[PDB]
């Protein structure tokens with residue numbers, strides 16, 4: 001049997017009958033929630049519990065979109081950004097505390113994971129080459145992201161690096177085209193690939209960049225066997241879960257339907273295809289997996305969270321100690 005699975009989304013803050021029906025198919029392995037599905041933690045918790053009454057094996061993910069959810073949805077813990085964490089003598093400890101807090105709360109509201117950490121590099125073109133600003137300090141990024149992952153793992157959560165092989169040097173010439181990073185594989189290896197290389201052995205999963213690196217492969221990274229098999233699983237020895245990029249095309253189009261795109265993604269080596277914001281495309285992709293008679297990738301359940309839903313997480317000693325450490329570092333309050 002070919003292996004693969006579909007991760008989809010829903011429209012609202014609760015399940016429709018149509019939602020319930022699509023979630024029952026075994027080829028659906030995951031559901032991702034966004035700010036549009038989130039009112040507050042207790043609602044998120046009950047939405048997750050309702051999904052698990054249908055499918056206890058479903059992987060439930062939140063795209064917090066760069067601390068996005070925590071900002072306008074009341075009641076989630078506000079955590080410092082990595083650049084604020086970096087400017088401390090105990091930055092590693094603080095990054096651990098942040099990974100631990102985020103993963104503890106996300107699992108307390110019934111989710112398995114948050115897609116984190118970001119491994120993309122910030123390149124200041126205003127600075128000149130060689131400086132840790134134009135290059136983006138990839139070793140420091142890998143150090144602090146590795147600490148953040150330790151915190152996530154300590155709370156029971158599997159970690160997903162994004163966006164492989166790194167989109168920090170990609171340039172969006174316009175709105176229609178897929179961004180490109182036209183540097184050689186040697187240049188990429190010594191810069192944006194570094195955090196992925198450093199952490200491939202620690203990460204449980206990766207998400208690909210929606211970028212063409214035309215000197216390496218003509219295809220976006222999520223569809224390239226050279227990127228996913230030769231470099232990621234081969235050179236980086238990565239044995240974790242590979243998510244596709246979003247198989248719904250709304251900004252940078254590619255040809256074919258979600259059916260051919262999920263086929264191409266699994267062909268390149270993805271374990272789980274994502275179809276967001278497009279239920280019609282999700283049903284086309286599901287139909288494709290049904291005709292392929294796929295079974296779930298043996299890797300997939302690595303992403304299941306070892307924590308669990310609970311309402312008392314914030315009164316626990318570890319939670320208070322973690323916040324007290326961020327407070328002592330002047331990062332919160």
Ligand SMILES: [Cl-]
Pocket residue numbers: 154155156306307
């Ligand atoms: Cl745990």
